UniProtKB/Swiss-Prot annotation:
UniProt main location, coarse: secreted
Source species of the chain: Staphylococcus aureus (strain MW2)
Name listed for the protein in its UniProt record: Thermonuclease
Gene Ontology molecular-function annotations: endonuclease activity, active with either ribo- or deoxyribonucleic acids and producing 3'-phosphomonoesters; metal ion binding; nucleic acid binding
Active site: residue positions: R29, E37, R76
Protein localization: Secreted
Disulphide-bonded residues: none
Record keywords: Calcium, Endonuclease, Hydrolase, Metal-binding, Nuclease, Secreted, Signal, Zymogen
Cofactor detail note: Binds 1 Ca(2+) ion per subunit.
């Protein structure tokens, strides 16, 4: 997989962000993570703020598509997002603000990495695992 530059337009939810990718606005859905929804579930606003803060404070945002389908039925790009080299998907799981979701159409490159982050958050009984 390879990383591509992107520019933040707007954070929408804990699991969704609007980015300028290769010249045009685009909504991205973070791969392999299920965050509480605000559109209001518990930890939903916490997950949203986390994603918002992490992307807004970064100097560089990069998107990394996996090897499976690159967009869902709603037209959102499916990717791993990096804020200053740190994967947003992983940070959410590690902080206990998201659960690892089921693999979707072959996009599983980072599933083990995320499963490990989740096991650790569970052990520490962080947020969602409270």
């Amino acid at each position: 997989l390879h990383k591509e530059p992107a520019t933040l337009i707007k954070a929408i939810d804990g699991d969704t962000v609007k980015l300028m990718y290769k010249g045009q606005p685009m909504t991205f859905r973070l791969l392999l993570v299920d965050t509480p929804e605000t559109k209001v579930e518990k930890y939903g606003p916490e997950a949203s703020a986390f994603t918002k803060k992490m992307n807004e404070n970064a100097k560089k945002i990069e998107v990394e598509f996996d090897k499976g389908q690159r967009t869902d039925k709603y037209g959102r790009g499916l990717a791993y997002i990096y804020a200053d080299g740190k994967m947003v998907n992983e940070a959410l799981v590690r902080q206990g603000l998201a659960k690892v979701a089921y693999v979707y159409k072959g996009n599983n490159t980072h599933e083990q990495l995320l499963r490990k982050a989740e096991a650790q958050a569970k052990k520490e009984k962080l947020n969602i695992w409270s």
